[PDB]
Amino acid sequence: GSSCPGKSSWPHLVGVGGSVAKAIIERQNPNVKAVILEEGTPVTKDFRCNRVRIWVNKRGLVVSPPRIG
């Protein structure tokens, strides 16, 4: 698939706290939810362009994938 409606990719919210990153996904794409799980959280396999799955790396940072799937 290509880029769905709404922000298709974020800048660099990594290290900005899952909170700030989440606010960006909402203010960047009101049609996508901002999720925040630790890199490894057993979640579903299919990704939705309406859900920016942000994750946090044990390194103590927020790895927010600046690209929706």
Domain boundaries, the chain: 1-69
User: If you write DSSP's letter for every residue of 32-62 in order, what string do you get?
Assistant: SEEEEEETT----SS--TTEEEEEEETTTEE
Strand 61-63 and strand 33-38: the pairing is: unpaired
Residue 61 burial (C-beta neighbours within 10 Å; 0-12, 13-18, 19+): middle
10 close to 66: Cβ distance less than 8 angstroms: yes
DSSP 8-state symbol, 16:
S
Alpha-carbon gap, residue 55 to 36, rounded angstroms: 5
* CATH superfamily, region 1-69: Trypsin Inhibitor V, subunit A (3.30.10.10)
Backbone discontinuities in the chain, residue before each (C to N > 2.5 A): none
Residues in contact with 67: Cβ distance below 8 Å, sequence separation at least 6, in sequence order: 8, 9, 10
